[PDB]
Amino acid sequence: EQLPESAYMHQLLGLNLLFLLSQNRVAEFHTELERLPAKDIQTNVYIKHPVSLEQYLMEGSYNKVFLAKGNIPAESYTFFIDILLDTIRDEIAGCIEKAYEKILFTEATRILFFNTPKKMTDYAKKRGWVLGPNNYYSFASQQQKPEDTTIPSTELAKQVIEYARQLEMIV
């Protein structure tokens, strides 16, 4: 415990924070934040702004994250915030399947990226969301809970065989 200061100390942990966020190492992400108690909180905007970035990545905010990505006046970060770009690309490509029952195409152009790309072919073909007239169309799927009725019945067979088994015991 001598610890003299250095050149890239305050943002080398930001580099590790960035790519260990881009690995989805969230347990590592929150056990890494412990060794610098107030350095990561009170100050050091290239720690506080990556974790404010993650504070926006907490719930669902997409383009506010890209505003924060559109302002880092530090060094490159690009080889890992492009991984963050892609992990937001499949984030919209994951949360598309919810109650976007119909969406006009150019708002998806705004949120996704790339105005008239072949990435619209990538999404509309690798994904579903049938490229119809100015609209990604939502298909329907069901579960019905029909047959089960039986996995209830056999898991209750397991559970009540267990109840009877523990009440059963005698040695």
Added chain:
Amino acid sequence: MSEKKQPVDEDNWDDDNVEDDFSNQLRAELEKHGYKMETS
């Protein structure tokens, strides 16, 4: 016995749940009635 090692250091509760509903907003809510009967 039980020295509990020290390096370290109804009547009350259901209506405290209800009071946590009552705490930050409308504590003595009786006048806001008469405050807002003439507002709109």
Added chain:
Amino acid sequence: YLSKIEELQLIVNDKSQNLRRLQAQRNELNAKVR
């Protein structure tokens, strides 16, 4: 050392003797009631 610790962790196993105490009082119960 080889013939030393083996006896000790053998005598660690004597909770089975107390289980036999439990079951001996249980057998006492059932035999006397019968």
Added chain:
Amino acid sequence: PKNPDLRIAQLRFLLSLPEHRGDAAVRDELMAAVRDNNMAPYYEALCKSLDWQIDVDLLNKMKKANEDELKRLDEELEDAEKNLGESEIRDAMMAKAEYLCRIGDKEGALTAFRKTYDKTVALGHRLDIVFYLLRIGLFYMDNDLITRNTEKAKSLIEEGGDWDRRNRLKVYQGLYCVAIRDFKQAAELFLDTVSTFTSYELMDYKTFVTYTVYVSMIALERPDLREKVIKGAEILEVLHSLPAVRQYLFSLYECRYSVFFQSLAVVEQEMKKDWLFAPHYRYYVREMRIHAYSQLLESYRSLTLGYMAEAFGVGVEFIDQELSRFIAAGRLHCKIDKVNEIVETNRPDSKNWQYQETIKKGDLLLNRVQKLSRVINM
């Protein structure tokens, strides 16, 4: 002599908790304190009231008069053991020891009560002692010393069927049930209102009427409510006496959905400045709100704020936030819409209320038996 003793604890509550209300209370607290020779129960309030500039002689002459009155009886005891009556010593200074205990604190209570209790074989004196315990344990709000001899008195009640102690303890357990959040029990104990003797704790029979309406307007919905307080007559005459009592009754039974908070404003502002409702008036208000909203929402399913603004009152956003909190509180299930101006109801609310209370009591009972079963074996 503990009959005028309730107004003391009344003013003990009424003085200290409202900040600006601190003049008339200390005035007639003095007017009650420097007579009756009161010495002990007000040292806390002496540290809550003023300095009482000369505490030197004005109270020590009083406690010296108390010492004279005390050991005239404690030197009457040898004159009463000369002719042993029914232990005339203890029979004399039992009520005079409760005089001394009206002066004193609860130590004179806890020794004089259990002293004179094993004297008598006539249980009426025992019943009077139990009344004394219930009253002084209510004075210090000792809600646990009194629940012992509630049961131990009901054992002394129920050797048959009587008048006195049955109706008296009906009043006593009614006040204990209204002390805690217990309302259907308070209504069932205040069911009588017929042979409730004009008392010291019933300092007005009219106040007894106000209490038994202020809990019966919560307890039951309507399957005896009209029959007791509307179709009845003995309650109807004395609620016909006061306007404000009959006001909320015929309001809520008439469903005048705007005068409700006027009536409730009067009753609630009195409820603030009234004792034995201090942890209670807050849940009381939302209770009345949901109880009115139930009988409103029961009839209609095609209703909205556009029906609220003219028959209920104003502040559509207040209706919005209030019903939002009360519906999202797991209470009065009915679903509301935004600007399409729709408040739809769920027509049975009897699916999960079925499942509800059983899990909600099993939670607390299992949490009890966890710790208490792991108490044994260290």
Added chain:
Amino acid sequence: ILDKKFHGILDQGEGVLIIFDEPPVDKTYEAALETIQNMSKVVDSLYNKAKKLT
């Protein structure tokens, strides 16, 4: 409706009354009055616990 003489629901834009009913709620009493008493059971056993401890 208010007097429980009747199990209905009204319409204002339609003038339609509709009748519906589901009687049995025996499970609530059935278990709740067990549990409320067993509270007092374990509170009676509290004294035996305090006697065996100290």
Added chain:
Amino acid sequence: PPGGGEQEPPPPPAPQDVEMKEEAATGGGSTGEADGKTAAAAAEHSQRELDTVTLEDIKEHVKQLEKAVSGKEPRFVLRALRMLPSTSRRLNHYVLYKAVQGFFTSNNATRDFLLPFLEEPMDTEADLQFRPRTGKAASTPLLPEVEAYLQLLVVIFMMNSKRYKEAQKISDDLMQKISTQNRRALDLVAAKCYYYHARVYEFLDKLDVVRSFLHARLRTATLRHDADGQATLLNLLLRNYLHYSLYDQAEKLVSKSVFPEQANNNEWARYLYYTGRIKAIQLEYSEARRTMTNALRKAPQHTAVGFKQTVHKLLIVVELLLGEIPDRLQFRQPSLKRSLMPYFLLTQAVRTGNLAKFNQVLDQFGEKFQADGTYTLIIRLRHNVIKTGVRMISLSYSRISLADIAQKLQLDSPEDAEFIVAKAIRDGVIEASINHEKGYVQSKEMIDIYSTREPQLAFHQRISFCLDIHNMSVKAMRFP
């Protein structure tokens, strides 16, 4: 001054009576009866020695001025005790030194003769045989010198007393530990002295040398002997490897020593608590909240004892991080309101849908957070707050506009109300459908896949727990 002159004689002798006879009878029973007792990892007099340690945790701490225990140290160290006929004159000396203390005044030799207060177990070729005698007589003198709490020139002599206790570790790890369990008596004595050893290292720097020593001290269990020392040393290894951030916790994961199987209900319960905090720091909640609750209800045996309120504090951190939340002051104490009320105002803020109440409390009591070491709540609890708000309002409104709920919950924009509610669906909170042309979020209701699935799963837990109650009840009833 004459009054103080007669306030001088009565304070020595009654401590000089009971503080004498406690270790006289108790230590005689312990050291002599540890020969037999087929389970003498701790004798019944060793639990009585635990009880006397509980007594002089509040009776006397310092080396006792006014000349009371100041002669008990050169009395109780000057013990050769080679064989029992050579101890009878010492049994007389136990009263003869009291006669010396009564005829004259005693001689309080502080901080100079304490190191030749460690040469009396060498007196005229003395004994290393009864190491619980010399171990208990190296704890009960030398640890009240630490309860003097001097921290001046004798912390090195504290340390050298603990170096002679490392020589007690040498005699512990070499001298004939076959079936006597002098080692395990010294494992409970080791627990005690390692706590006070640890407090010495609390008043000084990090013990990374003695952390390697503590590594070896843990690993010397399970192979030479294996009883309860692994427990005590496991928590004594945990105590700062919690407080220091790095690796240590994956080691707690891969630790195949979670199970020392009994720890007098004290160490086991607090072990549950420590590993509960450990599982709580890596965001795992349901696995952690059960051992948090069990650790709270497992060692409760006071009223507001402190670290009981530390566990009762930390317990609802993870439940602020769940979404379901209890009212915390269900166990409030009159020695607790100070240490509950800012934290209770925090959970007060969380139990509504507001976030502007929540954001103020960080800047309010971030210094309290610096004290409590719980910064991780504020980076992620906003998530749970907004999930609670959207859950509440979604249960409220059947059909809501995003451009109303967003500004009602200060989101400042309607377009990410789509995002937050879209992951209120994607994260599985709400089912509610949206037209993303008009911006309205209609919500519907159903039951009966509730009643087909949901209650029976809870009843399975209830009856598994109550049948475990039945199992433990019978298998602990059957000792008679």
Added chain:
Amino acid sequence: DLYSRYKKLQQELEFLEVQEEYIKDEQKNLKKEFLHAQEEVKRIQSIPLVIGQFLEAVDQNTAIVGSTTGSNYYVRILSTIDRELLKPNASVALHKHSNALV
């Protein structure tokens, strides 16, 4: 001596194995013993029953009855009887020769 002191402990380990196996089967067997013993008790009634009346009880498993033969007896009782069913005054079945509560 450690060759002997280590080798002789294997015998006691084998012994504790044996008895831990043994008391399980004993415990299982004794319930079969117990129920057949219960029903071998039950040969007492079968058709010569005489009717006394219950008068008093000393304590557990001892009572006092007075027969309809005028006199009065100090009898023992069977462990079969549920003790709720008695002690105001009940017509009770007695044995002829032994004259005991049945």
